Ligand binder design. Structure first.
Ligand SMILES: O=CNc1ccc2[nH]c3cc(-c4ccccc4Cl)c4c(c3c2c1)C(=O)NC4=O
Ligand SMILES: O=CNc1ccc2[nH]c3cc(-c4ccccc4Cl)c4c(c3c2c1)C(=O)NC4=O
Ligand SMILES: [Cl-]
Ligand SMILES: [Cl-]
Lengths: 261, 261
């Protein structure tokens, strides 16, 4: 026995539990720090599935310098497992923050939503300037650590001019991407961020398909149970515009007047 | 055989060569990236020397979020060696940049010196806000990667209220620290930065002891072979003031009017 995982880390609890791969909260014995470690089944080898597993590693390994992307420390292979060791974000995911807000009827306020939008948008600005796109922006892939919001789960990351794409979650998926039209991939991360912010504003759970799904993709915001400024609401709406060329880029988003404050 | 070091990395060249420990430029086989790896002799165990080796690891492991501090990825132990795997900075050290400038008679210009001073100062602002001090600020511990300047070599890092200190390089050493007076440790990193900037301005090699050494510690700048603004020169001079309470803190430095631009 005696893997690197067992020798180098103390596993504290399971925090994530999945199709491909569990995640643990662990303390590295040598440095004293807590890390989030994903232990996934090691794919067939030379396989399509292995290439997709290695893009996550390659993605994380060039996306290690940003405050709004989860930092990467190491990745390795042993047994029939692949392991990636990442920054532990101690406030958990945005999805659980939203879920708790939903039960108490107290949501993110307009100032907090602007801050979320701006932070994740700086994250995206950086990803996109590396000629990469994320492809699965959603609350369960945004982690909380001033609160700081960090983009994690780089499992769908691809290069921006990619001719093949692994489509992200349905509820956050831009229609041009469903229609296999990959001409403005970055604007699909923009579309998914707007809907991430809508969920944070206290929206009902987004639809996966059917008529409500198509109504959003026509450029119509889900109902938000709180009064937002017209300007803020306009910016969210433009972010889900049917024409992805109309959506702001991430650079135009972070320099937007609405987010100045 | 088969250490983690050998299995996980391809060693490309030796780039650093020392008393305690060689440094190699290596490619991690799994992620494709280049890292700078220090392989040092593993100290006796429970020893004073081991505690000092582990502060570097502990230091690096809380100083992993900053643009102006060399990022840390992992550290481990095998054989009779300790290894730390760090960000590879591809422009090398500030000391070699200065050394090359010295031979060609073309130094950092006032704008470049302000940028160096400001960058390293942001690095120090962060270290100091973690209630740590560096204790060995000098050109061979500043790495270059827009150029970016990054503080590395965390081997003398201590907590700010530390009653015992490992004194840094003589040529950069503030006198109160020589006199075992540890009441304003952060201001010793300030004093060492000023002299780092003077070397970058084209100064002769600094003295290790003797009368020229004491003359600097009286608050007098070494000769700089280029015309600097009075304001800039005043700020350097205040940074080496004999009274360390007169020296600016790192926060006051980065907010200084002279560095605004
Ligand atoms: O509860 C506190 N923090 C928390 C709770 C549940 C979690 N699930 C996760 C999955 C992940 C994760 C997601 C996709 C791929 C790999 C990992 Cl480690 C991470 C984290 C968490 C995480 C962090 C994290 O902190 N950094 C992460 O990279
Ligand atoms: O020549 C290009 N880059 C270069 C050249 C010589 C070098 N010596 C080094 C020592 C170190 C170093 C210094 C103290 C402790 C541990 C290390 Cl790895 C580093 C680096 C270099 C380094 C980087 C670095 O890039 N990141 C570092 O942490
Ligand atoms: Cl979600
Ligand atoms: Cl030096």
């Amino acid at each position: 026995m005696k893997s690197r995982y067992t020798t180098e880390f103390h596993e504290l609890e399971k925090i994530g539990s999945g199709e491909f791969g569990s995640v643990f909260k662990c303390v590295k014995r040598l440095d004293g720090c807590i890390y989030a470690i994903k232990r996934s089944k090691k794919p067939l080898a030379g396989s399509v599935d292995e290439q997709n597993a290695l893009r996550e590693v390659y993605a994380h390994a060039v996306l290690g310098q940003h405050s709004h992307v989860v930092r990467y420390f190491s990745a390795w292979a042993e047994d029939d497992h692949m392991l990636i060791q990442n920054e532990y974000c101690n406030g958990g995911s945005l999805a659980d923050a939203i879920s708790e807000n939903y039960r108490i009827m107290s949501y993110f306020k307009e100032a907090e939503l602007k801050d979320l939008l701006l932070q994740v948008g700086r994250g995206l600005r950086y990803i996109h300037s590396m000629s990469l796109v994320h492809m699965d922006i959603k609350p369960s892939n945004i982690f909380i650590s001033k609160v700081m919001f960090k983009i994690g789960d780089l499992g769908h990351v691809t290069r921006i001019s990619s001719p093949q794409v692994e489509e992200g979650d349905s509820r956050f998926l831009a229609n041009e991407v469903l229609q296999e039209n990959y001409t403005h991939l970055p604007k699909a991360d923009i579309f998914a961020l707007a809907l991430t912010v809508v969920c944070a504003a206290g929206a009902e759970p987004l639809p996966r398909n059917g008529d409500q799904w198509h109504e959003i993709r026509q450029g119509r915001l889900p109902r938000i149970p709180q009064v937002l400024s017209q300007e803020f609401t306009e910016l969210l709406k433009v972010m889900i515009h049917p024409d992805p060329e109309r959506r702001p880029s991430a650079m135009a988003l972070v320099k937007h007047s609405v987010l100045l404050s």
